[PDB]
C-alpha cells in the first residue's frame, strides 16, 4: 500500500483506495469507547510485559490531535497548556499575506506584511495547513537577555537598523463603502 | 512568538548600540529571561536551538510534537560541530563600552509574529469634544472622538482617597455642567 | 468554481488556495458555525438532585 | 427569540484565521454560566476537538 | 523529490546503526 500510494499524483492513487482496500476505518466518538486503540504500530506491539496484546486499531500519528492554530506551534508538549492556548488564540491575529489576490479584494481592515518569511523549523502538520506558502511572521535573531531594562516586564527591544531595512514592516488598508 | 510570549516593543536602538557576537551578528529581539521559568516554555528554547542548527546546516528542521527522535542532546551535539556552544550560548559584547558580558547570552534564530494591535489605532485623547443628544455627556469610542468612562470603581477609589474635590470636579465640572 | 483548474481561478481574480465553503451575502463572507446539541432518538437517564425526582429518563 | 451568532463574518486577517473560523464550533449553552462542567475539556475529545485551541475570555 | 530520497536514506541509515541507544533526555510509558 505504501509503494502504491507513494506513486500517487502521477497515476491516480488516492485515499479512497485505502478505504476500499480495508486498511483504514472511520470510528466515531461513540464507537471509540469499545476499541483498543494503539498509539504507534511498532513500539506498542513487539513483545514485552503482557499489557493487553489485543489491539484492534492504531492511530496514524499522535500529533494529529492538534487543530489548526495549535499545529503550527513547534514542540507544543514542551510548554504548559495555557501558553499553548494563548498562542493558538493569538495566531489568528498574526498579520501577513492573508490571500494572494489581496489587491483585488476590497475588504475592511486588511493587513499585509512586506516580507513574510517561512519558519526555519516547520512541523510535519503545517505542510498541509498551507502555512509555508502563506506564513505570518519573520525569523529574527532573538537573544534572550536583559540588555538595558526596557524589556524586563514582558517587553522586547528591537533593532532600529533592522526596522530601517524592512524588519516586520507591514501595511494597513481601510476600505470604504458609499452610494 | 509561537509559544505565547507576547509583548510590546519598549525601545528601539540602532545597530551600533545593540550587542554583538564574536562576529557582526546583532540580536533583533531581546525578550526577558524571567518570562521563561514562570511560564515554563522550554519549547521556545528548543525552537531557538533547532533554528540555529538549521541555519548553520542550511535546511529546514522538524518540530513534530511527538517524534521519539528529537531530544536536546542530539541537537546540541549537532550544533557543537559548527564552532558554536552545544547549548547555544554565545559571548556577546556591551554595545556601548565594548566590554564582554560576564554571563554568556543565549542568542539564536527564532520565528516571531506581529499582531494588528498597533498603538496608532489605540491612542486617543479628548478636550471638550462632541456631546451626545439625550444626556449631555461626551461620546464613546475612539472613532467618534469620545471620552473615557469614569467607572464606579474609580469613584470608590477616589472616595477612599478622600479627594472629594477631585471627585466633584470629575463628575460635574468635566462631565456635564448645567444650571 | 466546481473542479476548476487554477488557471481560470487566477484569471477570475481568485486563488486556488482559498478553502471556500462560505456564503456571500451583500458582499460579506458569511460562515455557518457548526452547532452541537444532544443526540436525538437516544435514551438518557440523568439523576437531577435539585428536584423531586431521583432519576429522569429524557429522550 | 432565536439564536444569535450562528452566522459570523469570516475573519480574513490571515490564512490560519480563515482556516480556524471555517472549522469552528459553538455550544448553545448560555453565555457566562455559573456551572463549570461543560467548559472543562472532556476525555472523549481525543482526536475530534483540539485540546489547546479555545478562547480565554468569558466563552 | 530530493527531500523524499533524503528521508528514505535517513530512515535506512537509522535502521542500520542499531548498535546502542543510551540517551538521557527520552523516556516512554510502560504500564503493567
Amino acid at each position: 500500500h505504501i509503494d502504491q500510494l507513494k506513486e500517487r499524483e502521477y497515476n491516480n492513487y488516492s485515499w479512497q483506495d485505502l478505504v476500499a482496500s480495508g486498511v483504514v476505518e472511520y470510528i466515531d466518538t461513540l464507537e471509540e469507547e469499545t476499541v483498543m486503540l494503539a498509539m504507534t504500530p511498532d513500539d506498542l506491539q513487539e513483545k514485552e510485559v503482557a499489557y493487553c496484546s489485543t489491539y484492534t486499531h492504531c492511530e496514524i500519528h499522535p500529533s494529529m490531535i492538534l487543530g489548526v492554530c495549535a499545529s503550527i506551534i513547534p514542540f507544543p508538549d514542551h510548554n504548559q497548556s495555557p501558553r499553548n492556548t494563548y498562542q493558538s488564540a493569538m495566531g489568528k491575529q498574526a498579520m501577513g499575506v492573508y490571500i494572494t489576490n489581496f489587491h483585488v479584494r476590497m475588504d475592511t481592515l486588511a493587513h499585509v506584511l512586506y516580507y513574510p518569511q517561512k519558519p526555519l523549523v516547520t512541523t510535519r502538520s503545517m505542510e498541509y495547513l498551507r502555512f509555508r506558502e502563506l506564513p505570518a511572521g519573520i525569523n529574527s535573531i532573538v537573544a534572550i537577555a536583559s540588555y538595558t531594562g526596557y524589556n524586563q516586564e514582558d517587553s522586547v527591544i528591537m533593532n532600529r537598523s533592522a526596522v530601517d531595512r524592512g524588519f516586520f514592516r507591514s501595511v494597513f488598508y481601510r476600505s470604504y463603502k458609499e452610494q | 512568538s509561537r509559544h505565547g510570549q507576547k509583548g510590546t516593543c519598549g525601545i528601539q536602538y540602532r545597530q551600533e548600540d545593540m550587542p554583538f557576537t564574536c562576529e557582526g551578528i546583532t540580536p533583533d529581539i531581546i525578550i526577558n529571561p524571567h518570562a521563561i521559568p514562570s511560564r515554563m516554555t522550554i519549547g521556545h528554547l528548543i525552537e531557538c536551538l533547532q533554528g540555529k542548527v538549521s541555519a548553520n546546516k542550511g535546511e529546514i528542521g522538524d518540530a513534530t510534537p511527538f517524534n521519539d527522535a528529537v531530544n536536546v542532546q542530539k541537537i546540541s551535539n549537532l550544533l557543537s560541530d559548527y564552532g558554536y556552544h552545544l547549548r547555544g550560548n554565545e559571548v556577546l559584547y556591551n554595545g556601548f563600552t565594548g566590554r564582554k558580558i560576564t554571563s554568556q547570552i543565549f542568542i539564536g534564530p527564532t520565528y516571531y509574529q506581529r499582531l494588528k494591535h498597533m498603538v496608532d489605532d489605540k491612542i486617543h485623547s479628548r478636550a471638550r469634544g462632541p456631546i451626545q443628544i439625550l444626556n449631555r455627556q461626551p461620546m464613546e469610542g475612539r472613532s467618534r472622538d469620545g471620552g473615557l468612562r469614569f467607572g464606579e470603581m474609580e469613584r470608590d477609589c477616589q472616595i477612599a482617597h478622600g479627594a472629594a474635590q477631585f471627585l466633584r470636579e470629575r463628575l460635574f465640572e468635566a462631565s456635564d455642567p448645567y444650571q | 468554481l466546481n473542479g476548476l483548474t487554477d488557471r481560470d481561478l487566477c484569471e477570475l481574480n481568485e486563488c486556488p488556495l482559498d478553502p471556500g465553503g462560505y456564503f456571500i451575502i451583500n458582499g460579506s463572507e458569511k460562515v455557518l458555525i457548526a452547532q452541537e446539541k444532544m443526540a436525538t432518538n437516544t435514551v438518557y437517564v440523568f439523576a437531577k438532585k435539585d428536584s423531586k425526582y431521583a432519576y429522569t429518563g429524557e429522550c | 427569540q432565536a439564536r444569535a451568532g450562528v452566522s459570523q463574518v469570516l475573519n480574513r486577517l490571515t490564512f490560519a484565521s480563515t482556516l480556524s473560523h471555517l472549522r469552528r464550533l459553538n455550544s448553545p449553552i448560555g453565555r457566562d454560566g455559573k456551572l463549570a462542567k461543560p467548559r472543562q475539556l472532556h476525555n472523549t475529545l481525543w482526536g475530534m476537538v483540539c485540546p489547546a485551541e479555545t478562547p480565554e475570555g468569558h466563552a | 523529490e530530493w527531500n523524499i530520497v533524503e528521508s528514505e536514506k535517513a530512515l535506512v541509515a537509522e535502521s542500520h546503526n542499531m548498535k546502542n541507544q543510551q540517551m538521557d533526555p527520552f523516556t516512554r510509558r510502560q504500564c503493567k
Binding site: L18, D42, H61 | - | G21 | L19 | -
Partner: peptide
C-alpha cells in the same frame, strides 16, 4: 510485508493522501 522501524516516513504519506483527496473544509 510489514513495515518495521521504517514507519515515520510512511506515517505521513497516508496523511498526504487524505489531505489531497479531502480538503480541510470538506465537511462544510
Amino acid at each position: 510485508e510489514i513495515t518495521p522501524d521504517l514507519w515515520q516516513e510512511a506515517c505521513w504519506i497516508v496523511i498526504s493522501s487524505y489531505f489531497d483527496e479531502k480538503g480541510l473544509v470538506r465537511q462544510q
